[PDB]
Design a binder for this molecule. Structure first.
Ligand code: NA
Ligand code: NA
Lengths: 214, 216
């Protein structure tokens, strides 16, 4: 297992460079996130290699499709054994319900099922283009609320909103964040994705130690 | 390369079933669509395996992420040599621009870059949960217009919007459709037509395809 809430983003262009960083660290100190870049390049096999090496994996593919296809993609993630997988709440309640129901047969050995609400990249201008008058946080709030209605395990959101979300949605609703690793823990966050501060550091392990220690 | 506008959806749950079907057909008669069902199970190597068999491939993963991540995913698809790849218009105009710019190094060898607008699964009630009061057809038209503004090659849409989108967006702008029949889809202006079970679960898929192509 691992006591850490830290998930280290592996956003590498190349297999060996990723694994050479992964050798330098220990499954006890963090989990790993595998996103669309490395998955499109290497496939589930890279996730298996991380599993061999003892790590738990957040498969961050942000599934956004019709309900049958998302349910089958999420079930494939569960068959792969990953620890967390995410879907777009923008896919709607039926799609999330279907992703949830696909995991029921896996029991307590299913990955956590997290919704992306509003991508951290989106400003209000981006939202106007798509016909969303609200602010990024009000729309994210509405999507988070829809996510909890469908019984998913939690949402991706800013640490700024952790306070507000743990309020409206409950303590057990997991908040994943893609404001210090101390300030965020106190404000509600459950797991913390951190990339370059760890992967571009000199002693990622010590950096890991330092974040963890707080 | 085939002259057929048919793209047969590979939505199997294992490699051997998929290959049993694919080895029955000829790459001159159709293209193949690989979506999340099979990419999450078998990864990019399955795409390379289909190319070894001579097929062109629509990688249907519907990338919806921040711009710099989508852009890397799109370039990974072009490095794979796929014929088509898609993204969600919902990711916004900067994500689509970043996707298009990721294909500039690949020149004429680049995949066609297509944006999903509204998934065919979404009814008005599914959209209202999200704060969209526009009808699906109108929300898709809005996303389709944004897609063309960003310089992408076309959109996924229903044959029911085909005539509309060709009027609004022009003959060059590609329409990929996933009840109207093939010939009627063509007549409406659809460029490429994804077809799944009618072919994959047919008695003789070689014969079902040939009948489809004959009407086109
Ligand atoms: Na995000
Ligand atoms: Na669709």
């Amino acid at each position: 297992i691992t006591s850490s809430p830290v998930v280290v983003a592996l956003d590498y262009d190349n297999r060996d460079k990723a694994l050479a960083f992964v050798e330098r660290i220990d499954p006890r100190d963090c989990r790993l996130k595998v996103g669309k870049e490395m998955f499109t390049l290497l496939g589930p096999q890279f996730v298996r290699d991380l599993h061999q090496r003892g790590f738990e994996v957040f498969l961050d593919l942000k599934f956004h499709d019709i309900p049958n296809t998302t349910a089958r993609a999420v079930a494939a993630a569960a068959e792969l054994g990953v620890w967390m997988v995410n879907v777009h709440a923008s896919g709607g309640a039926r799609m999330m319900t279907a992703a949830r129901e696909a995991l029921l047969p896996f029991g307590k050995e299913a990955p956590l099922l997290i919704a992306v609400t509003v991508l951290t990249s989106m400003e209000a201008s981006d939202l106007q283009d798509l016909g969303i008058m609200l602010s990024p946080a009000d729309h994210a709030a509405k999507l988070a609320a829809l996510t909890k209605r469908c019984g998913l395990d939690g949402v991706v959101c800013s640490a700024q909103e952790a306070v507000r979300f743990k309020q409206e949605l409950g303590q057990e609703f997991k908040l994943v964040t893609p404001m210090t690793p101390e300030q965020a823990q106190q404000a509600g966050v459950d797991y913390m994705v951190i990339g370059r501060p760890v992967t571009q550091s000199a002693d990622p392990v010590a950096t890991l130690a330092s974040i963890n220690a707080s």
